[PDB]
GROMACS .gro file of C-alpha atoms in nm:
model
  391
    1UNK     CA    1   0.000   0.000   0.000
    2UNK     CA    2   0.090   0.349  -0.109
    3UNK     CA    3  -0.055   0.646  -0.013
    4UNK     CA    4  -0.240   0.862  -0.297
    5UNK     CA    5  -0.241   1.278  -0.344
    6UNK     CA    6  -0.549   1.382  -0.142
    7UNK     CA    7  -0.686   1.731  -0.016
    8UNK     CA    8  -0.736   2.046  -0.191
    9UNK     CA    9  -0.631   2.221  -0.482
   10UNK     CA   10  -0.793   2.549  -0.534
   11UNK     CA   11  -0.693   2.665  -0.933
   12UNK     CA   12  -0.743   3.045  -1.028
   13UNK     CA   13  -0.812   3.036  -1.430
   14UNK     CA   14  -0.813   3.399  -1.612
   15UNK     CA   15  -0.978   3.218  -1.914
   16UNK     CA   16  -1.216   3.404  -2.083
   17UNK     CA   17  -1.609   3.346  -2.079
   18UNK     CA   18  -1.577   3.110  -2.387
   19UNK     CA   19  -1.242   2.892  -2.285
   20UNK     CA   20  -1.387   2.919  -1.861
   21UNK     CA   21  -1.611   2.583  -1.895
   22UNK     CA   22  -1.377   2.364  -2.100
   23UNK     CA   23  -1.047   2.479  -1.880
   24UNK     CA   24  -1.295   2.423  -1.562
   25UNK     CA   25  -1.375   2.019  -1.674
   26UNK     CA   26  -0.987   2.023  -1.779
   27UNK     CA   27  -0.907   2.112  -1.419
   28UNK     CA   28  -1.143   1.864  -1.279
   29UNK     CA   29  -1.036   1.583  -1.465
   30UNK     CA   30  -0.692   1.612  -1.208
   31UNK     CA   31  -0.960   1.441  -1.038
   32UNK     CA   32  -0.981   1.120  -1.270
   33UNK     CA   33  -0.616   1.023  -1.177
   34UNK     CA   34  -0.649   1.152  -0.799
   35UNK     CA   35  -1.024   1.062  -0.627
   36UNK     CA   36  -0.914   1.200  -0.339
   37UNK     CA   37  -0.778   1.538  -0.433
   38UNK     CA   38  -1.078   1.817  -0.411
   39UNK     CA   39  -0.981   2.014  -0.758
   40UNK     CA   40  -1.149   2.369  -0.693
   41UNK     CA   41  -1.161   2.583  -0.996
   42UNK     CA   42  -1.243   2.957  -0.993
   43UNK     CA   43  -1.229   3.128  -1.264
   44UNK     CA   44  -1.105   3.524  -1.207
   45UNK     CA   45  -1.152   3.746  -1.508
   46UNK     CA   46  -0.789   3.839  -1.636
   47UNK     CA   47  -0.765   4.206  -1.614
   48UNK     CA   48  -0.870   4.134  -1.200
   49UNK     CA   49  -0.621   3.859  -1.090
   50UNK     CA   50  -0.314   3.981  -1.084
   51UNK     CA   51  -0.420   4.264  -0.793
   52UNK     CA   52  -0.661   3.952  -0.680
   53UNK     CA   53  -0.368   3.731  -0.663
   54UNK     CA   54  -0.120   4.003  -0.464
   55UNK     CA   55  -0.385   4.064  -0.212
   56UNK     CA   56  -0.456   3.757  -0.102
   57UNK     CA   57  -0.095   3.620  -0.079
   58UNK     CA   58  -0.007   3.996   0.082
   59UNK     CA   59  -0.323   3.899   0.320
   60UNK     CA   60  -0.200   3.536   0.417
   61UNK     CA   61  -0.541   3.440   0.336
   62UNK     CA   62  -0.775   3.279   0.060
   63UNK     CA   63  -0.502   3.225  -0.181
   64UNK     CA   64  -0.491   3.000  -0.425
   65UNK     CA   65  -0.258   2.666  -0.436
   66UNK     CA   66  -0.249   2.703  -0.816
   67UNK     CA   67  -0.222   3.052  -1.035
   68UNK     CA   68  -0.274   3.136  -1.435
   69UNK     CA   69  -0.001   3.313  -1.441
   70UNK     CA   70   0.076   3.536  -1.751
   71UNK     CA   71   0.436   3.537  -1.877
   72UNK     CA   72   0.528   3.865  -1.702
   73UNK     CA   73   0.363   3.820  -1.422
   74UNK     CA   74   0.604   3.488  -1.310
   75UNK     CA   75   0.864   3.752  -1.256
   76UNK     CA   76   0.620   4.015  -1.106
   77UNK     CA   77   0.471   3.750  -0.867
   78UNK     CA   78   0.828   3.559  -0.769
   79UNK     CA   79   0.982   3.896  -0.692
   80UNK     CA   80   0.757   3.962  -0.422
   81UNK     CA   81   0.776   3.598  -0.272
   82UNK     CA   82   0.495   3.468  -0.344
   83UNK     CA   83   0.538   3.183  -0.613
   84UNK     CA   84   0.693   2.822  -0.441
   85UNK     CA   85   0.975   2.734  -0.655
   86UNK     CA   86   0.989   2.403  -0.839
   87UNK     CA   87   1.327   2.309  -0.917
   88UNK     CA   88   1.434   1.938  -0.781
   89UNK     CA   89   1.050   1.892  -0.736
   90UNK     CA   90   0.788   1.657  -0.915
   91UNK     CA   91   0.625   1.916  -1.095
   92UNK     CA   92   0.888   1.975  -1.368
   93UNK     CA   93   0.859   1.569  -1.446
   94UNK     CA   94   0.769   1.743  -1.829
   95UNK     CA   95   1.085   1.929  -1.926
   96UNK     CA   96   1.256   1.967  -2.253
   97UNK     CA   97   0.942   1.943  -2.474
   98UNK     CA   98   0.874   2.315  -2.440
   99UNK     CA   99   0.930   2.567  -2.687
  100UNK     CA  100   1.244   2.759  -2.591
  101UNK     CA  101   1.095   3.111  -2.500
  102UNK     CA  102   0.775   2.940  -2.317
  103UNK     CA  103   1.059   2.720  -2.077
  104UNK     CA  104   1.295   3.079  -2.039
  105UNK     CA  105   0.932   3.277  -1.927
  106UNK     CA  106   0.895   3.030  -1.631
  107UNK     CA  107   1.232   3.150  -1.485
  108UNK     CA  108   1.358   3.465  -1.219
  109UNK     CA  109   1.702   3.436  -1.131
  110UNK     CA  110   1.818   3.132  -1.167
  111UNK     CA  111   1.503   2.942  -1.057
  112UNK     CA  112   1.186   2.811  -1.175
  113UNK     CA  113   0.840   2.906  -1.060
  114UNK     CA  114   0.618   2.787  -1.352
  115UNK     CA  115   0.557   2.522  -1.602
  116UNK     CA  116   0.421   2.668  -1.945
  117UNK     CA  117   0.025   2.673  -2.074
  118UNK     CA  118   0.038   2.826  -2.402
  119UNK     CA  119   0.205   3.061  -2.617
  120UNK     CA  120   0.100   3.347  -2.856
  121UNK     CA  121   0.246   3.654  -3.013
  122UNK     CA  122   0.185   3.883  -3.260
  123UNK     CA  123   0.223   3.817  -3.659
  124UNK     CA  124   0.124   4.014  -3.972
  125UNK     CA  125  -0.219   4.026  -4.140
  126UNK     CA  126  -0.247   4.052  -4.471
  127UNK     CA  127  -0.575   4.063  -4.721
  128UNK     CA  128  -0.504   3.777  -4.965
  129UNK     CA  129  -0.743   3.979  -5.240
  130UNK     CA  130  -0.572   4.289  -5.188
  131UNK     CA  131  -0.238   4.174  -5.236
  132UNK     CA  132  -0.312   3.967  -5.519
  133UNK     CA  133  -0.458   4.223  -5.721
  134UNK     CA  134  -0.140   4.441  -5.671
  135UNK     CA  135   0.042   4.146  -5.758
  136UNK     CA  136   0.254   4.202  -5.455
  137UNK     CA  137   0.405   3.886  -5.204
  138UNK     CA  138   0.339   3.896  -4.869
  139UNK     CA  139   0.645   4.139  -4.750
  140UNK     CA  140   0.918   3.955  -4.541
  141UNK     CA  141   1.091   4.302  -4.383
  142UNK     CA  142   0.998   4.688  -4.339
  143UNK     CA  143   1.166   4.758  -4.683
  144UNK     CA  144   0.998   4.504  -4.879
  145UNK     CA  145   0.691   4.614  -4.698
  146UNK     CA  146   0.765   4.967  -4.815
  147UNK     CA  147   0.739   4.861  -5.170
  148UNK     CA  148   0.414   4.658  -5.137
  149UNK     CA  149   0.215   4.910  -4.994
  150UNK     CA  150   0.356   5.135  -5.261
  151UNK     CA  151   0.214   4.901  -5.538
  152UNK     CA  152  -0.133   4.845  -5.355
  153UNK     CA  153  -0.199   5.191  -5.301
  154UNK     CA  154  -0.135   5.256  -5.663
  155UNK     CA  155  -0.360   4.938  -5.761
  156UNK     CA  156  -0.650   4.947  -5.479
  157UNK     CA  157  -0.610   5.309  -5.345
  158UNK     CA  158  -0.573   5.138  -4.986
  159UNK     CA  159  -0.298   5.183  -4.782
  160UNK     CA  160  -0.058   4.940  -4.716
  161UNK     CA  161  -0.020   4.928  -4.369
  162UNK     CA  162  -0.223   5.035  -4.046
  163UNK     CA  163   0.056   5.043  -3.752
  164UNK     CA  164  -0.053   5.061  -3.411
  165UNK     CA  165   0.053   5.366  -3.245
  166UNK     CA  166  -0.095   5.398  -2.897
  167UNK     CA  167   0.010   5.060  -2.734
  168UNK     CA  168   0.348   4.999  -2.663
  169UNK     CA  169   0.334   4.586  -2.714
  170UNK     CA  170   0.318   4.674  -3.106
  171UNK     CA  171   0.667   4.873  -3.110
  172UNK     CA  172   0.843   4.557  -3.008
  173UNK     CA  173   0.812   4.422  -3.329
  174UNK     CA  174   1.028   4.712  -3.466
  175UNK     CA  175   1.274   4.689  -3.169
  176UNK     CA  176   1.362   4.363  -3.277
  177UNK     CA  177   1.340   4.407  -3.635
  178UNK     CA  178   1.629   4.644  -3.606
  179UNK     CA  179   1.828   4.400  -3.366
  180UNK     CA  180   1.737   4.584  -3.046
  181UNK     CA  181   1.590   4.520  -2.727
  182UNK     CA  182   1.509   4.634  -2.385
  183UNK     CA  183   1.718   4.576  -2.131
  184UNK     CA  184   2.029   4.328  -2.085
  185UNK     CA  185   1.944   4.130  -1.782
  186UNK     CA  186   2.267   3.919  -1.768
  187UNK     CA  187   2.442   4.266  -1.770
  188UNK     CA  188   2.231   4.443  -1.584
  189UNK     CA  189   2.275   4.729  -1.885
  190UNK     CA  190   1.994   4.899  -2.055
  191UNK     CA  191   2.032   4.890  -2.429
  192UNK     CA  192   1.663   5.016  -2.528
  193UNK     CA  193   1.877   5.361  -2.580
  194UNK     CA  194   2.197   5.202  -2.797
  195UNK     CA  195   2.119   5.274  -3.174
  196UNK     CA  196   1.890   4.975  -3.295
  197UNK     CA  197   1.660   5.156  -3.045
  198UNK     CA  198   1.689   5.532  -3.249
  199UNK     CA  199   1.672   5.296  -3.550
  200UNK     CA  200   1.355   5.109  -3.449
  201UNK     CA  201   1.140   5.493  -3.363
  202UNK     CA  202   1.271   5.637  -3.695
  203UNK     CA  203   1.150   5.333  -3.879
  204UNK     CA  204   0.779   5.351  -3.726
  205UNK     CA  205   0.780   5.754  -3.834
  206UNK     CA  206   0.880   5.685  -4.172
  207UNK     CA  207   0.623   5.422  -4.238
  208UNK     CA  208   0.364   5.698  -4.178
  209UNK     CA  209   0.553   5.926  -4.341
  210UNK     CA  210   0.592   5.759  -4.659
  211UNK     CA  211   0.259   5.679  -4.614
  212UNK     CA  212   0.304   5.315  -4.616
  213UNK     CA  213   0.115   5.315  -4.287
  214UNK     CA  214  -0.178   5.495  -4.097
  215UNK     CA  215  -0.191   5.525  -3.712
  216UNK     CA  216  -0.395   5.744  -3.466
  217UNK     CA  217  -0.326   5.871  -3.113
  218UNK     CA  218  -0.607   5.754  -2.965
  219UNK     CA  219  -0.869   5.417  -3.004
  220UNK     CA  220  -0.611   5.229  -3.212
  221UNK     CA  221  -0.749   4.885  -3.161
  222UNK     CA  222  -1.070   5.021  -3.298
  223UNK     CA  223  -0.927   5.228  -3.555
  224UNK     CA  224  -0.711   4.934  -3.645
  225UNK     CA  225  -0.959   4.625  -3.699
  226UNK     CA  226  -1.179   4.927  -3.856
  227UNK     CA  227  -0.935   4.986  -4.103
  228UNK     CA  228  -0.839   4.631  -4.187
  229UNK     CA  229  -1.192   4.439  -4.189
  230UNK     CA  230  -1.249   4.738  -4.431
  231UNK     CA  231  -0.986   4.762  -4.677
  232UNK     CA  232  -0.862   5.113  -4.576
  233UNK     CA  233  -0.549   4.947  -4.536
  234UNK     CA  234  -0.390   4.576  -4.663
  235UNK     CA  235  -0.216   4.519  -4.369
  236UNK     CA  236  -0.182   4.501  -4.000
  237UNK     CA  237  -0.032   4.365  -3.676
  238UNK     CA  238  -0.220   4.183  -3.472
  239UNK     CA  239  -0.254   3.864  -3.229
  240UNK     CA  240  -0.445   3.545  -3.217
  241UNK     CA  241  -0.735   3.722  -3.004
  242UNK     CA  242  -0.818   3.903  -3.368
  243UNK     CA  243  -0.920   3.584  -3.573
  244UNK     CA  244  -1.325   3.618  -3.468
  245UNK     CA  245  -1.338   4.012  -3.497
  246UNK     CA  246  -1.146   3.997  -3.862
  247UNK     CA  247  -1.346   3.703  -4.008
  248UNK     CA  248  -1.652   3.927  -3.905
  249UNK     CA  249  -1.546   4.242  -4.160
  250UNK     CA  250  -1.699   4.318  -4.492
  251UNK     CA  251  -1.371   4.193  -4.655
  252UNK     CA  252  -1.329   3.868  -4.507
  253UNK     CA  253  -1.697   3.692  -4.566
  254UNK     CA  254  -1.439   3.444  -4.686
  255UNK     CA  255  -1.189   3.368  -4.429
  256UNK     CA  256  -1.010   3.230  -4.752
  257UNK     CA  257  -0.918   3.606  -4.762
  258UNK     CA  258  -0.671   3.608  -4.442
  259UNK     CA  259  -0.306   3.523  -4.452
  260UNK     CA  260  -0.130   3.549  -4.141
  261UNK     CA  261   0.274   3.574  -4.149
  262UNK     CA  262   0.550   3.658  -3.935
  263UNK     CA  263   0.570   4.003  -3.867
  264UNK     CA  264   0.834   4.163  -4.070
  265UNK     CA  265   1.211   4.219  -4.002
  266UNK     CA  266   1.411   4.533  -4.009
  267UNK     CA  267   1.760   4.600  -4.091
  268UNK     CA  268   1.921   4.368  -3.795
  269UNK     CA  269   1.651   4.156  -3.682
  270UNK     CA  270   1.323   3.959  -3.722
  271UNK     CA  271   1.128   3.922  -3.379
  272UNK     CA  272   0.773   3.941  -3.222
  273UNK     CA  273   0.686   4.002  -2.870
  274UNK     CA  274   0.573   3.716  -2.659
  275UNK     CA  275   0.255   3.637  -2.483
  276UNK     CA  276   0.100   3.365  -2.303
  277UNK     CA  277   0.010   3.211  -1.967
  278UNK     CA  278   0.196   2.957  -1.734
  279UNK     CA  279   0.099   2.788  -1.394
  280UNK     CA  280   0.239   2.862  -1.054
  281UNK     CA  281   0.237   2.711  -0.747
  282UNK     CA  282   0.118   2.979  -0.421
  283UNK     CA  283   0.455   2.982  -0.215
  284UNK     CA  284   0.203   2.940   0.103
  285UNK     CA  285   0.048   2.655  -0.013
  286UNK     CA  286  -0.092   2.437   0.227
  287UNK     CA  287  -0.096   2.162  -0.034
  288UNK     CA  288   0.222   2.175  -0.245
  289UNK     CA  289   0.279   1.847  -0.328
  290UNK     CA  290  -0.089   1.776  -0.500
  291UNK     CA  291  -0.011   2.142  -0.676
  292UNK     CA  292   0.326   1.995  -0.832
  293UNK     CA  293   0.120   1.724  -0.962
  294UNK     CA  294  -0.195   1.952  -1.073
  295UNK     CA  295   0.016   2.166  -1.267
  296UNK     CA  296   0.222   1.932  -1.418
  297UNK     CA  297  -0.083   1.786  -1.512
  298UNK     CA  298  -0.262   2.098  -1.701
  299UNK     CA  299   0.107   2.163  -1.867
  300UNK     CA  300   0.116   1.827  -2.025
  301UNK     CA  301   0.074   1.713  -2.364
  302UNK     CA  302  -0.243   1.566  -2.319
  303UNK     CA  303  -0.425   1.877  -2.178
  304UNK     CA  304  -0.284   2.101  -2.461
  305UNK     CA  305  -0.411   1.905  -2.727
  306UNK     CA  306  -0.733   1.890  -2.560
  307UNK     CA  307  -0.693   2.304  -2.500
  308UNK     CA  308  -0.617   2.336  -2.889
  309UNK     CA  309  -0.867   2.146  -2.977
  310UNK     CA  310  -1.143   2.283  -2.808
  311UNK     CA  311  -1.055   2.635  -2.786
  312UNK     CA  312  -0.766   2.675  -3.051
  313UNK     CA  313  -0.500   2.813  -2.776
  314UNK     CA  314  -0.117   2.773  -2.941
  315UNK     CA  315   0.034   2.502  -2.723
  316UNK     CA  316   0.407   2.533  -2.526
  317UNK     CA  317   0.532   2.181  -2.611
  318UNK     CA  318   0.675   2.114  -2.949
  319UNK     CA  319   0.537   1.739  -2.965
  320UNK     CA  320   0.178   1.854  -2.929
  321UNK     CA  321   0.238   2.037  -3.247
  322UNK     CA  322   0.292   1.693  -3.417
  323UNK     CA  323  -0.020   1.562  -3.344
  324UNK     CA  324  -0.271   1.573  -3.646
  325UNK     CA  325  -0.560   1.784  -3.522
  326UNK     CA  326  -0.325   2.010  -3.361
  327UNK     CA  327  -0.112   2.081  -3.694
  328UNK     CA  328  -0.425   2.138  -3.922
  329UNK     CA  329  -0.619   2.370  -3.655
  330UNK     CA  330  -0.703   2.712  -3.839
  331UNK     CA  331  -0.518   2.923  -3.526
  332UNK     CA  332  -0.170   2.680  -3.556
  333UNK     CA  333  -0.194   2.731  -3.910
  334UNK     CA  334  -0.209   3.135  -3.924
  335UNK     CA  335   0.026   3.165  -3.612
  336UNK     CA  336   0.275   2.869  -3.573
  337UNK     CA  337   0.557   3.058  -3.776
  338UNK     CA  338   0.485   3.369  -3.609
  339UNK     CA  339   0.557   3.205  -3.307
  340UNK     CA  340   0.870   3.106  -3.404
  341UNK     CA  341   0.992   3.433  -3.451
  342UNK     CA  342   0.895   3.489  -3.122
  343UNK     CA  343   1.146   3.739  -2.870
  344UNK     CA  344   1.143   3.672  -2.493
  345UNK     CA  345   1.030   3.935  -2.229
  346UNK     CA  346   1.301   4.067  -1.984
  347UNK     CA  347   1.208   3.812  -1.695
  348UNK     CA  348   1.260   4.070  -1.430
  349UNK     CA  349   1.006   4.165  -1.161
  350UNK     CA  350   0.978   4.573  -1.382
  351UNK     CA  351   0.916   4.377  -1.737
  352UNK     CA  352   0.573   4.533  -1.745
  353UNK     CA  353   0.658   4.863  -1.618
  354UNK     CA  354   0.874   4.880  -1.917
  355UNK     CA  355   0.614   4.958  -2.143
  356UNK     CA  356   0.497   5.292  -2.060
  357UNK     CA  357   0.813   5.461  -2.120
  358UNK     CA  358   0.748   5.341  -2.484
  359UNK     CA  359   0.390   5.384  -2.474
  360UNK     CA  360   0.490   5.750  -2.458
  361UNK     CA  361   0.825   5.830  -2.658
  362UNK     CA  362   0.608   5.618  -2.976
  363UNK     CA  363   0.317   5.830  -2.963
  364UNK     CA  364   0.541   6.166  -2.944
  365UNK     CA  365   0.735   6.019  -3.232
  366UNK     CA  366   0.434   5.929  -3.414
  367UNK     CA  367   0.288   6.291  -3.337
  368UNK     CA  368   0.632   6.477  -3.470
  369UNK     CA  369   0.678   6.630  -3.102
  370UNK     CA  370   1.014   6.382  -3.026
  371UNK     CA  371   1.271   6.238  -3.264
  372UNK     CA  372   1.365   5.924  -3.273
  373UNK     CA  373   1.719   5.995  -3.062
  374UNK     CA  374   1.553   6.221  -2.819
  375UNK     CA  375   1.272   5.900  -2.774
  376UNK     CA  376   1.547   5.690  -2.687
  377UNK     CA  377   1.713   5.840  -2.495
  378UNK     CA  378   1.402   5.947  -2.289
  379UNK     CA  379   1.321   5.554  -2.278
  380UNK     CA  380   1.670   5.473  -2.186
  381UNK     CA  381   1.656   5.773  -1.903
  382UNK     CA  382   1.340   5.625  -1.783
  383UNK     CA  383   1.465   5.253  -1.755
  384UNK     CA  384   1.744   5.350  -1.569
  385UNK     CA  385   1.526   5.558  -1.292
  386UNK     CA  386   1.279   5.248  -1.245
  387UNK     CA  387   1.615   5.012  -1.276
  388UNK     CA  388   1.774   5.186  -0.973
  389UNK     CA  389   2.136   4.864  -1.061
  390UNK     CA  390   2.087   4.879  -1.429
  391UNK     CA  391   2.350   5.062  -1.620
   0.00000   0.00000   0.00000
């Protein structure tokens, strides 16, 4: 006789009204395996947990055993003690199988305090018509793009490109397109400032001002699907989380008329930013051992396949990838290369206080009040004051 896992495992999910009742029987199923474990899902709505998930840890009361973590917020929540870490413990039993950046987002200095969920990033978006009837290919870098929208606008009248201009995640792709990026952790050095950073704010100002792109100041999600379900513009940058909205506009009755790609490189670089969700284990958890085993359970390749299957989330682990339904799915399809171009976050407890600084040198670009040296440095001036040890 052995003993078996037994009492409870309370599971915060931030999965959204659609994915809530399929992650909630995914969750129970633990249960299948373990009879004696009491599997309690709740599901938190994402844009609450993270302050949820600080107060009650902060409170020493009603947290959870098991957190949805985003990819940032490992770092955010480890920093402040309250993720248990899981090296040299069961829950890792799943290891090399996940795709590189998903395994580096579960880490914070040297230790692990996640196991990955699923992946996305962003890609470009192309209208297959449009294109075709400007007998342009899908652009592979900001000067090809150039060109194409060049040659649609003179065929269709639209413009080639909407770029985002009032959220920070979407100048990331141009960061890395010119070789650049945020910080060097390793280093402790901010490079957001060295010249792949003027580069990358120059090139966002020129696409408007060649007018291969369109932006606005304010509403730019809006202004953005607006503009591409429409066929003001070819193009545009954009995530998994746009597939429903898009295949809703008056140019894409036939979803035979979207083309996803990678987004495109710039003069040093090819990258997009990445996104996702992980599990972590409460570091006051008064039930760590059936936790290892819960979340090793909802990171394995059995539940993502199920996950992609039923709610088309882009699994972590390369084999899952392999399997048939999983390969022909319409989200793999559009996004699995994009993910593959995808750039890892800084994994540092500030990663998401990064973005402002950008938020607001872009837009002042964009607007003609900043150049793109005065940006950076202004970027670089501001990571160093909320990076107290950074160079």
């Amino acid at each position: 006789a052995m003993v078996e896992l037994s009492g409870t495992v309370t599971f915060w999910d931030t999965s959204n009204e659609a994915e809530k009742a399929t992650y909630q029987a995914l969750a129970e199923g633990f249960e299948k395996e373990h009879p004696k474990v009491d599997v309690k899902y709740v599901n938190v709505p994402f844009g609450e947990a993270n302050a949820k998930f600080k107060n009650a840890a902060g409170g020493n009361s009603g947290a959870p055993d098991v957190m949805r973590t985003e990819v940032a917020w490992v770092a955010d929540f480890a920093s402040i003690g309250y993720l248990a870490p899981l090296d040299g413990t069961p829950a890792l039993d799943d290891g090399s199988d996940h795709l590189p950046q998903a395994a580096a987002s579960t880490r914070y200095e040297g230790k692990t305090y996640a196991v990955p969920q699923v992946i996305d990033t962003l890609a470009l978006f192309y209208n297959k018509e449009l294109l075709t009837k400007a007998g342009v290919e899908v652009p592979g870098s900001v000067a090809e793009l150039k060109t194409a929208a060049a040659e649609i606008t003179e065929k269709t009248g639209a413009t080639g490109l909407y770029l985002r201009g009032d959220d920070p995640y979407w100048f990331l792709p141009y960061l890395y397109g010119e070789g650049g990026d945020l910080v060097d952790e390793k280093n402790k050095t901010v490079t957001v400032d060295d010249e792949a950073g003027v580069r990358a704010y120059r090139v966002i100002k020129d696409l408007v001002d060649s007018k291969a792109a369109i932006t606005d100041a304010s509403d730019g999600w809006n202004n953005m699907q607006n503009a591409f379900k429409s066929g003001k513009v070819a193009m545009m940058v954009n995530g998994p989380w746009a597939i429903e909205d898009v295949k809703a506009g008056a140019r894409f009755k036939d979803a035979g008329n979207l083309g996803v790609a990678p987004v495109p490189a710039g003069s040093a670089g090819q990258g997009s930013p990445q996104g996702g969700w992980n599990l972590s284990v409460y570091a006051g958890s008064k039930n760590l051992d059936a936790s290892y085993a819960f979340v090793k359970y909802m990171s394995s390749a059995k539940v993502q396949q199920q996950t992609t299957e039923k709610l088309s989330l882009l699994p972590t682990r390369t084999s899952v990838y392999e399997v048939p339904s999983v390969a022909d799915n319409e989200m793999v399809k559009f996004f699995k290369p994009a993910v593959d171009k995808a750039v890892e976050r800084p994994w540092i407890a500030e990663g998401n206080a990064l973005f402002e600084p950008i938020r607001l040198q872009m837009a002042n670009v964009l607007s003609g009040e900043t150049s793109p040296d005065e940006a950076a440095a202004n970027t670089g001036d501001a990571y160093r004051k909320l990076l107290k040890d950074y160079k």
